Design a protein around this ligand. Sequence first.
Ligand SMILES: CC(C)CN(C[C@@H](O)[C@H](Cc1ccc(F)cc1)NC(=O)O[C@H]1[C@H]2CO[C@H]3OC[C@@H]1[C@H]3C2)S(=O)(=O)c1ccc2nc(NC3CC3)sc2c1
Lengths: 99, 99
Amino acid sequence: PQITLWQRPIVTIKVGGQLREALIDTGADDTILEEINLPGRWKPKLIGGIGGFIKVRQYDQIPIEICGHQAIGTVLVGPTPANVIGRNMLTQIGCTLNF
Amino acid sequence: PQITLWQRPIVTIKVGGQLREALIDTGADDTILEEINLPGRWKPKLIGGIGGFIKVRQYDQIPIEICGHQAIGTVLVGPTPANVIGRNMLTQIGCTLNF
Ligand SMILES: CC(C)CN(C[C@@H](O)[C@H](Cc1ccc(F)cc1)NC(=O)O[C@H]1[C@H]2CO[C@H]3OC[C@@H]1[C@H]3C2)S(=O)(=O)c1ccc2nc(NC3CC3)sc2c1
């Protein structure tokens, strides 16, 4: 779709067999989801944003469906205040900015 | 322009008579700039992001040029680790997401 920015650009995702809503976030390099149960091995990572840093679990090669488009990549899980789809996944679904 | 997301979507802005680079940030409701000298009255505001919250100076009705497009609106100034152009300004320049 085309999405305008009068409201938060929230879309439906499926990840780890679970449905969630997430922000299309061009200011996010990586994809970060609130506590969600994902399978398998992970590595602890500290990431930084406005306000400071959080500890996340890094999961690699995680399949995700983003508004009906398929991607696979790194998903970081931790105490983010918002589920954010970052550029690592947005590049796979052909998402662009236009003005 | 159209901007793809293989790299950070950074553009040149002019604000307060000064030139800066800033991220086109669809996950940002508001526009937040690192310490920059802006004229006139401001109101202290606490904003939240990943990692916690920052104190910012809120300036209203600030003109900004964003990659050659003119906007006017609220600009928050404070210890953000990145200059971010949020939806309050991106809607004025006709910025959309497309996939
Ligand atoms: C700040 C920006 C530069 C980065 N963030 C992406 C922004 O879009 C976030 C998303 C957000 C929304 C709401 C919220 F409560 C918290 C976060 N917006 C944001 O904080 O908005 C703030 C601010 C703007 O106005 C209002 O709107 C929402 C809220 C409020 C005040 S990030 O989430 O920290 C992030 C994400 C991925 C990532 N991957 C990395 N990978 C390593 C480096 C290579 S680093 C990294 C850092």
